[PDB]
């Protein structure tokens, strides 16, 4: 009603939008250091 | 044992044998749980 709105809105994504309104996929990598064993480690720099 | 780790050895017997052996590591990893009590899963 007046000054009452559903809090969510849709993004009207179209290929015709300028770049700032084109959709972007965002993935954020949150890296956690817990008491748990580390389990996520990059490759080992081994040699001959 | 407490972080939490497990060692084991499985051998046949024929109410424990009067002997000695040393157990090998089975599980080794922290979880953040205070273990003061335990129960088996049947």
From Swiss-Prot, chain A:
Changing residue 9 to Y: Reduced host ACE2-binding affinity in vitro. It comes from the Viruses. Changing residue 17 to T: Reduced host ACE2-binding affinity in vitro. Residues 35-48 are annotated as: Disordered. Changing residue 12 to S: In strain: Omicron/BA.1. Changing residue 35 to P: Increased resistance to human covalescent sera neutralization. Changing residue 14 to R: In strain: Omicron/BA.1, Omicron/BA.2, Omicron/BA.2.12.1, Omicron/BA.2.75, Omicron/BA.4, Omicron/BA.5, Omicron/BQ.1.1, Omicron/XBB.1.5, Omicron/EG.5.1. Attaches the virion to the cell membrane by interacting with host receptor, initiating the infection. The major receptor is host ACE2. When S2/S2' has been cleaved, binding to the receptor triggers direct fusion at the cell membrane. When S2/S2' has not been cleaved, binding to the receptor results in internalization of the virus by endocytosis using host TFRC and GRM2 and leading to fusion of the virion membrane with the host endosomal membrane. Alternatively, may use NRP1/NRP2 and integrin as entry receptors. Binds to host ACE2. RBD also interacts with the N-linked glycan on 'Asn-90' of ACE2. Cleavage of S generates a polybasic C-terminal sequence on S1 that binds to host Neuropilin-1 (NRP1) and Neuropilin-2 (NRP2) receptors. Interacts with host integrin alpha-5/beta-1 (ITGA5:ITGB1) and with ACE2 in complex with integrin alpha-5/beta-1 (ITGA5:ITGB1). May interact via cytoplasmic c-terminus with M protein. May interact (via N-terminus) with host bilirubin and biliverdin, thereby preventing antibody binding to the SARS-CoV-2 spike NTD via an allosteric mechanism. This is Spike protein S1. The chain holds residues 485 to 532 of 1273 of the full protein.
